[PDB]
Amino acid sequence: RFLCGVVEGFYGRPWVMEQRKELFRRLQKWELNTYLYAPKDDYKHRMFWREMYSVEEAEQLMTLISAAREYEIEFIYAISPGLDITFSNPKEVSTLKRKLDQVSQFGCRSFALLFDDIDHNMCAADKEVFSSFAHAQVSITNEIYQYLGEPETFLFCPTEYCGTFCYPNVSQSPYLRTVGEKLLPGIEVLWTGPKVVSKEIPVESIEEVSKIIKRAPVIWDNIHANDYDQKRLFLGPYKGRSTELIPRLKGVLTNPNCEFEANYVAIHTLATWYKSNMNGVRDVLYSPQMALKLALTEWLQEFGVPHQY
Amino acid sequence: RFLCGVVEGFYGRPWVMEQRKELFRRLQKWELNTYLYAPKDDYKHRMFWREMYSVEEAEQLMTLISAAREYEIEFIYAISPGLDITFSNPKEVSTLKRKLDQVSQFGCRSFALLFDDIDHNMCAADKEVFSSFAHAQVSITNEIYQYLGEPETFLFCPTEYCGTFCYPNVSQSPYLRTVGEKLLPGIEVLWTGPKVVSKEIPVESIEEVSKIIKRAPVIWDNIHANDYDQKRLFLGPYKGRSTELIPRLKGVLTNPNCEFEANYVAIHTLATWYKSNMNGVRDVLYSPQMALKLALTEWLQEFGVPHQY
Amino acid sequence: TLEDLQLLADLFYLPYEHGPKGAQMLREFQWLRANKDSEKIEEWRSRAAKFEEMCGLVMGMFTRLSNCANRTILYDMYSYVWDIKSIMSMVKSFVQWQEPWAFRGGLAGEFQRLLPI
Amino acid sequence: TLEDLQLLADLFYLPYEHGPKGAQMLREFQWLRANSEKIEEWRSRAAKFEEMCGLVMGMFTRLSNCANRTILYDMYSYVWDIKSIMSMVKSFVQWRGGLAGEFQRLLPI
Ligand SMILES: CCNC1=N[C@@H]2[C@@H](O)[C@H](O)[C@@H](C(F)F)O[C@@H]2S1
Numbered sequence: 007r008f009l010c011g012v013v014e015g016f017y018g019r020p021w022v023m024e025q026r027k028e029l030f031r032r033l034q035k036w037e038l039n040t041y042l043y044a045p046k047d048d049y050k051h052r053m054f055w056r057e058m059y060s061v062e063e064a065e066q067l068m069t070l071i072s073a074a075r076e077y078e079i080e081f082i083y084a085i086s087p088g089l090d091i092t093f094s095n096p097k098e099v100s101t102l103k104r105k106l107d108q109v110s111q112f113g114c115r116s117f118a119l120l121f122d123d124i125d126h127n128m129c130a131a132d133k134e135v136f137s138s139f140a141h142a143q144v145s146i147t148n149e150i151y152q153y154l155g156e157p158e159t160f161l162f163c164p165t166e167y168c169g170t171f172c173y174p175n176v177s178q179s180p181y182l183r184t185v186g187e188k189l190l191p192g193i194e195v196l197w198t199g200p201k202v203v204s205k206e207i208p209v210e211s212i213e214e215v216s217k218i219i220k221r222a223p224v225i226w227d228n229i230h231a232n233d234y235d236q237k238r239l240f241l242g243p244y245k246g247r248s249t250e251l252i253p254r255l256k257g258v259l260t261n262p263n264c265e266f267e268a269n270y271v272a273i274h275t276l277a278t279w280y281k282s283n284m285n286g287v288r289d290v291l292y293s294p295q296m297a298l299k300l301a302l303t304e305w306l307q308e309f310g311v312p313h314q315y
Numbered sequence: 316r317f318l319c320g321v322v323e324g325f326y327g328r329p330w331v332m333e334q335r336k337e338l339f340r341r342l343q344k345w346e347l348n349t350y351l352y353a354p355k356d357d358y359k360h361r362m363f364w365r366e367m368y369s370v371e372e373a374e375q376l377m378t379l380i381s382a383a384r385e386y387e388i389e390f391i392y393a394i395s396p397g398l399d400i401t402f403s404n405p406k407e408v409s410t411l412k413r414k415l416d417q418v419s420q421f422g423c424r425s426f427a428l429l430f431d432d433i434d435h436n437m438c439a440a441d442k443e444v445f446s447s448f449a450h451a452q453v454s455i456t457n458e459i460y461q462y463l464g465e466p467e468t469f470l471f472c473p474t475e476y477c478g479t480f481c482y483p484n485v486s487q488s489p490y491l492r493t494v495g496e497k498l499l500p501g502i503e504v505l506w507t508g509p510k511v512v513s514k515e516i517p518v519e520s521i522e523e524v525s526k527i528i529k530r531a532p533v534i535w536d537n538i539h540a541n542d543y544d545q546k547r548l549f550l551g552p553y554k555g556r557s558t559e560l561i562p563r564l565k566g567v568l569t570n571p572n573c574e575f576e577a578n579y580v581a582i583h584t585l586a587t588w589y590k591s592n593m594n595g596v597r598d599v600l601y602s603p604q605m606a607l608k609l610a611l612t613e614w615l616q617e618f619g620v621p622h623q624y
Numbered sequence: 625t626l627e628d629l630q631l632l633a634d635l636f637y638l639p640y641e642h643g644p645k646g647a648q649m650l651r652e653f654q655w656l657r658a659n660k661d662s663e664k665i666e667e668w669r670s671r672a673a674k675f676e677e678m679c680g681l682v683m684g685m686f687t688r689l690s691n692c693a694n695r696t697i698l699y700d701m702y703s704y705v706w707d708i709k710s711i712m713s714m715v716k717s718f719v720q721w722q723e724p725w726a727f728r729g730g731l732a733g734e735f736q737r738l739l740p741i
Numbered sequence: 742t743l744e745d746l747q748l749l750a751d752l753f754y755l756p757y758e759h760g761p762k763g764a765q766m767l768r769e770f771q772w773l774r775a776n777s778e779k780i781e782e783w784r785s786r787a788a789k790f791e792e793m794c795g796l797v798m799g800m801f802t803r804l805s806n807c808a809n810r811t812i813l814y815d816m817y818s819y820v821w822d823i824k825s826i827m828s829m830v831k832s833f834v835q836w837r838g839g840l841a842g843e844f845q846r847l848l849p850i
């Protein structure tokens with residue numbers, strides 16, 4: 007019911023396979039359960055999405071998905087064709103089907119279609135064929151969803167992914183209204199909250215979103231995200247999201263710091279928050295100061311274990 | 316003797332061992348002879364200079380110096396203790412000798428001491444012991460060189476490594492004055508030309524340094540360096556340095572683009588320039604326009620050969 | 625092709641000089657920008673169309689480059705190619721005519737704002 | 742020590758909020774700056790700040806000697822920069838786009 011874990015969805019140097027395997031070992035330890043693979047600067051995911059995998063690439067993705075299953079971690083594979091896909095072109099849908107088809111032969115059973123950080127303008131050809139941008143994305147997402155035999159877990163990521171990004175506003179947004187109306191009920195929608203990096207995600211904020219998308223969203227939280235500034239790192243606790251939010255969401259996936267080792271507190275504190283109210287009604291249960299102390303206390307011993315670079 | 320090759324001495328992601336080996340293959344192929352290992356962001360070269368190598372690190376450094384030797388490529392190991400060395404402390408010098416001792420056990424015979432991007436201010440203790448900044452480096456460099464049994468190739472990189480960095484000017488610099496007068500004749504001196512990234516390196520400007528440093532320098536060229544701007548890449552030919560410069564230098568080491576693969580033209584055109592006046596006595600022999608025609612001709616076949624990421 | 629890389633190197637040439645093709649193209653966009661009644665409208669659209677043609681030659685090359693067998697050379701420099709491809713789409717189109725970032729630095733940066741240097 | 746990571750986490754905390762120890766130093770330094778029998782006060786506050794400045798440098802060097810270089814190597818780039826800024830803050834108290842840019846600089850923005 008609840009998708010809770012990590013999303014490697016930041017810009018910059020994507021994590022290595024050794025780190026990703028360690029992430030699953032840590033997620034399993036902290037009673038977490040999900041991993042969304044969306045590294046923006048890993049060419050086969052965004053920039054060069056059409057490009058198929060080589061033997062070696064296939065081999066390590068085979069081991070990674072294996073490792074995820076061993077550690078009881080849900081490996082959701084994402085792809086962002088949005089920057090250059092021609093939605094009306096059947097050659098483009100054929101490519102996305104072959105690409106996600108290759109990935110399902112690696113052990114993948116959970117996928118995602120991301121349409122975040124793209125210009126709303128459609129090419130000449132897409133404008134004749136599709137009523138709006140929202141329709142084009144949803145037709146492709148739905149055709150892919152059904153083609154992949156309607157997987158148990160399939161996530162959809164909108165262009166208007168936070169409060170701020172909705173034109174004119176969340177409530178009167180024609181795009182989201184299309185998204186919640188025409189996007190299949192078995193496909194979930196990712197939401198970052200009122201802003202990209204939300205200082206707080208009010209229980210009202212999401213209740214209002216769930217009305218337009220006609221479903222509870224999965225949060226792609228950017229609280230500990232640090233890709234937008236070379237000079238910043240975030241080792242603070244999970245703060246701003248009420249434990250009351252859990253019975254109102256289908257998930258929470260933190261997008262943390264680019265540096266894998268600087269995410270202990272980030273993922274530790276999240277798990278303390280998810281476990282404090284994992285049975286509710288549709289802060290009494292959690293305190294960042296307390297979860298922070300518990301996280302640094304365990305992190306401290308890690309600094310003493312000899313690990314050579 | 317002339318040291319001509321590459322210097323991996325840029326800020327940013329250092330090259331992998333695989334890339335460094337293929338580089339020795341390209342260098343040997345294009346009749347080049349030297350490689351200076353100086354990654355600014357390789358923590359065991361700058362920041363954590365005091366830190367000794369682990370087994371795996373030693374093994375990888377061993378395989379690399381083996382590959383270097385095998386491809387007739389001179390492997391010159393560099394270290395930058397300047398951000399926080401205490402020149403007077405014999406514990407800091409004992410540490411520098413231990414680390415370079417560990418590196419010579421890896422098969423390294425050539426070395427360097429870089430004091431390039433540091434402040435001239437000395438801690439009270441070094442002021443009480445040394446009469447100037449220039450004496451502190453020269454005393455520590457001459458002790459190290461002698462300790463290492465006076466290696467044939469020993470390089471020294473000054474704080475005032477270019478015309479513009481010289482206080483007040485190149486001929487009146489009291490720092491360079493001391494470098495040329497007190498730095499051992501067997502130790503070589505790195506120079507970047509009139510500025511950091513020089514448009515041209517005049518014959519006259521080199522004669523001016525050669526007088527004050529009392530020797531012909533080794534150029535640490537930044538013509539193809541692109542670490543100072545995220546939106547800049549250099550694929551043009553080695554242009555601006557006369558061939559009349561070869562009988563006036565101990566070498567030319569190019570610090571190229573951070574992206575290893577983009578440096579085909581940088582190193583190709585460098586080979587062409589060197590080979591055009593390889594036996595100079597005291598631009599009629601080299602044409603950047605021409606060298607580029609040949610560098611691209613040979614690069615073009617590479618794009619046709621399948622290689623997987 | 626050879627000519628493809630010549631155009632490629634010209635766009636990403638040297639720090640003090642752009643290549644001939646890159647400098648030729650820049651001069652033309654700068655010219656177009658600087659410019660019944662007088663017949664110099666004949667030369668402007670003839671010159672705007674010849675430029676919209678060059679904007680499609682450079683962009684054809686880019687797509688070509690991205691389909692190269694050597695994925696190793698391409699992955700190392702394509703991030704740069706993807707930028708100039710985006711700046712030349714809106715140049716061709718020109719011719720045809722939140723919150724944690726803005727308060728950068730964090731704690732180190734906040735302290736720097738109170739310092740002289 | 743656990744007290745070190747409490748300081749470490751306070752200096753690199755959250756996007757909209759700094760940790761208490763970080764917020765304390767900034768406030769004390771924001772106070773020393775805005776000032777010149779109130780001498781004994783400033784001097785007591787300037788001397789006690791130098792001690793905090795000095796002890797933060799201690800934790801910074803303590804961390805660099807950690808057994809776990811894997812963790813250290815990932816986040817020390819930040820530590821070094823706050824260490825540079827912390828030394829001169831204390832020492833103060835004691836007292837262009839390529840062809841892409843060329844074109845984009847002519848586009849309507
Ligand atoms: C649906 C969410 N998708 C997003 N994509 C971007 C991420 O790559 C960043 O890490 C993040 C921010 F923290 F910088 O900004 C946005 S949110």
Ligand SMILES: CCNC1=N[C@@H]2[C@@H](O)[C@H](O)[C@@H](C(F)F)O[C@@H]2S1
Nearest residue numbers: 324325326431476535537540543
């Ligand atoms: C002997 C000269 N030492 C230098 N160190 C720096 C290098 O790390 C950079 O790659 C180069 C580039 F910015 F131009 O600038 C300087 S030149």
